[PDB]
Write a protein that binds this ligand. Sequence first.
Ligand SMILES: N#Cc1cn([C@@H]2O[C@H](CO)[C@@H](O)[C@H]2O)c2nc[nH]c(=O)c12
Ligand SMILES: N#Cc1cn([C@@H]2O[C@H](CO)[C@@H](O)[C@H]2O)c2nc[nH]c(=O)c12
Length: 291
Amino acid sequence: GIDPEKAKLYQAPYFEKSEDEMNLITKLLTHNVLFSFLNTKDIKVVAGAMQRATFKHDDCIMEAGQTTCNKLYIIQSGHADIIKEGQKVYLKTEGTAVGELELMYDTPVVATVKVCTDELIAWVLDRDTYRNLVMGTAIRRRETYIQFLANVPFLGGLDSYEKLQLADALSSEEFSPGEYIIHYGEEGEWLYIIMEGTVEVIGRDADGEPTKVCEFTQGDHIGELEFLNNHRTVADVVATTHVITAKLNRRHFEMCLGPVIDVLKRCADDPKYEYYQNVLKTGAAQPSYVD
Ligand SMILES: N#Cc1cn([C@@H]2O[C@H](CO)[C@@H](O)[C@H]2O)c2nc[nH]c(=O)c12
Ligand SMILES: N#Cc1cn([C@@H]2O[C@H](CO)[C@@H](O)[C@H]2O)c2nc[nH]c(=O)c12
């Protein structure tokens, strides 16, 4: 990819944006996994470089085999089918991207992208800005996680593409024994998948004192309950050994884990979550919403 010392000398194009346009576009970017590790300044540079395009039902945004696209489209509204060898294989919806496979891996269009709503509105980024300012360590990050994610039970229903979309939004964090991964009573912004080690979940008894609920270990996840039910954290999660986690921000939860939300909701039937069911029944938490 692009030499990082040279990427610093790249100036993206700027197409003047109103404040309202900037707000709209940056919200799309901050919830799309391709931009997960860009800072605010760089998000806004990328937004400034984008241009709007619209399409109608049955238009092809790109067609398998084309070498003349080389653009990244982030969907504001509308849906499109991904068509391989005449078969619909995936549905792209609002906030998602098309064209990233070709830009990341430098190949002609792999699949046809065909609009299936009445209209579709997208924001479009050029290849050079994507390669110089966005792509970064995307391939290395995917290498860091894909083999692990292929072995995680709750992700078994995701295909390779979807597992890699999750990987795009992950970073790693390690904890020594006794360090708190999650504290009770906080906004609850982070979901952790345990790559190694064991944790304990600590609730509160009727007198308000800490009480151990259960343990989790490699392959398990913590932090999803607040994301599902929009409340502040209701337990501490503490490392009981050295722990290595993969970490996902709440802003990427819908895009990355949307397809497994019904799997995550199965915790209601798991005896390890009896304590939480009582939290919900008695209303023992206050709200917290995604930013
Ligand atoms: N092969 C393939 C796929 C291509 N795409 C998309 O189509 C655009 C044009 O190929 C890509 O830049 C993606 O955005 C896929 N999306 C979900 N699952 C898939 O398997 C594929
Ligand atoms: N109340 C409660 C519980 C909380 N958690 C976890 O702690 C994180 C922070 O609350 C959650 O996002 C879960 O990951 C629980 N895990 C198992 N059983 C439980 O009853 C609870």
